[PDB]
Design a protein around this ligand. Structure first.
Ligand SMILES: CC(C)[C@@H](NC(=O)[C@H](CS)NC(=O)CCC[C@H](N)C(=O)O)C(=O)O
Ligand SMILES: [Fe+3]
Length: 328
């Protein structure tokens, strides 16, 4: 098994006003997006230290009672409004991973999308503050820290594609973004239940099967345990871990709107028996956001693809990923 070329790109110019330096970042984003589809964003300005410090613990201190009380509807029929946000329980002997998903903190009962009961919008659920002091504050703060990094990255992608820097970011707004954070725990287990291990066609033991991400881009922090592989024509290649950087890739909404010029890389999660964290931020637009497709391979830039509303894209994609790769 070979190793994927995953360049480390200093993204710090994307926060500044040196326009040629921003173009030199954009060139690197373009090159990576046309190669394996992954890069590490470094010099990103976020305190990923601990982000990790916490997150395993939140993880290491929630009880079964609290898990049921926060569980999504797949695990708790009483919680019919929790499709996306809440706790995703492990099933000892069967399913090792567990996770906690939250959405835009601005989705409250006052928000018109909550009032209208629009699909994919939910009010976040949180544990008791006294049992988990500082957790909600940390998690909401983190959402906006990674929102800020993601905005800057979106400026890089726009410039890489020959657009003005706000081409994507103008649709990525605190008042309506459908972006989500997931705090994932992958446990060490001895014995590890074979029922929680999948076998790929090529024989590789996996925790999560091949997929394209449902996102515009995905902005991922993981602890220092190698696990991800990306598909290339020559087969799957290992993505090296880097617990100081953010691993970035495009999702299928980007592939759609660029006429597949920036493909959504197919990737999977190898099985590794080690305690680790996987903390994605899925960069989603607003429910009504529409980006007009274009084809940067064509002299006239024109695409015949239909502009997709982001919310309907997300509703279709999240359901499809559950059906194909299982309830997480
Ligand atoms: C590699 C990570 C992205 C992580 N995988 C994942 O998070 C996988 C594949 S991208 N993602 C999902 O299942 C979609 C979660 C969507 C979320 N509940 C929401 O409503 O927005 C892992 O470590 O398994
Ligand atoms: Fe993924």
């Amino acid at each position: 098994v070979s190793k994927a070329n995953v360049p480390k790109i200093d993204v710090s110019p994307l926060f500044g006003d040196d326009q040629a330096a921003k173009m030199r970042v954009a060139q690197q984003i373009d090159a990576a997006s046309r190669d394996t589809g992954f890069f590490y964003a470094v010099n990103h300005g976020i305190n990923v230290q601990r982000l990790s410090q916490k997150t395993k613990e939140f993880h290491m201190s929630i009880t079964p009672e609290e898990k049921w009380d926060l569980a999504i509807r797949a695990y708790n029929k009483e919680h019919q409004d929790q499709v996306r946000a809440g706790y995703y329980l492990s099933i000892p002997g069967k399913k090792a991973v567990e996770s906690f998903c939250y959405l835009n903190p601005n989705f409250t009962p006052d928000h018109p999308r909550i009032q209208a009961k629009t699909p994919t919008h939910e009010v976040n659920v949180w544990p008791d503050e006294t049992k988990h002091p500082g957790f909600q504050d940390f998690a909401e703060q983190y959402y906006w820290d990674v929102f800020g990094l993601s905005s800057a990255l979106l400026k890089g992608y726009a410039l890489a594609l020959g657009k003005e820097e706000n081409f994507f970011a103008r649709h990525f707004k605190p008042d309506d973004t459908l972006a989500s954070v997931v705090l994932i725990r992958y446990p060490y287990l001895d014995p590890y239940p074979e029922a929680a291990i999948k076998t790929a066609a090529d024989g590789t033991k996996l925790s999560f099967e091949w997929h394209e991400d449902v996102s515009l881009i995905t902005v991922l922090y993981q602890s220092n345990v190698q696990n991800l592989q990306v598909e290339t024509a020559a087969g799957y290649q290992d993505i090296e871990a880097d617990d100081t950087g953010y691993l970035i890739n495009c999702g299928s909404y980007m592939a759609h709107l660029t006429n597949n010029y920036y493909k959504a890389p197919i990737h999977r999660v190898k099985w590794v028996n080690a305690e680790r964290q996987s903390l994605p931020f899925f960069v989603n637009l607003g429910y009504d956001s529409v980006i007009d497709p274009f084809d940067p391979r064509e002299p006239n830039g024109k695409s015949d693809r239909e502009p997709l509303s982001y919310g309907d894209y997300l509703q279709n994609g999240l359901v499809s990923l559950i059906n194909k790769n299982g309830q997480t």
